[PDB]
């Protein structure tokens, strides 16, 4: 997930991957 709760400026390792 890219957005988790709310992480608009932050995407984790594996989101767009």
UniProtKB/Swiss-Prot annotation:
Identify the domain of life.
Bacteria
Subcellular location per the Swiss-Prot or TrEMBL entry = Fimbrium; Membrane
Disulphide bridges, residue numbers:
2-15
The record describes its quaternary structure and partners as: The pili are polar flexible filaments of about 5.4 nanometers diameter and 2.5 micrometers average length; they consist of only a single polypeptide chain arranged in a helical configuration of five subunits per turn in the assembled pilus.
Which family, according to the similarity comment?
Answer: Belongs to the N-Me-Phe pilin family.
Q: What is this protein called?
A: Fimbrial protein
Organism per entry: Pseudomonas aeruginosa
Q: Coding gene?
A: pilA
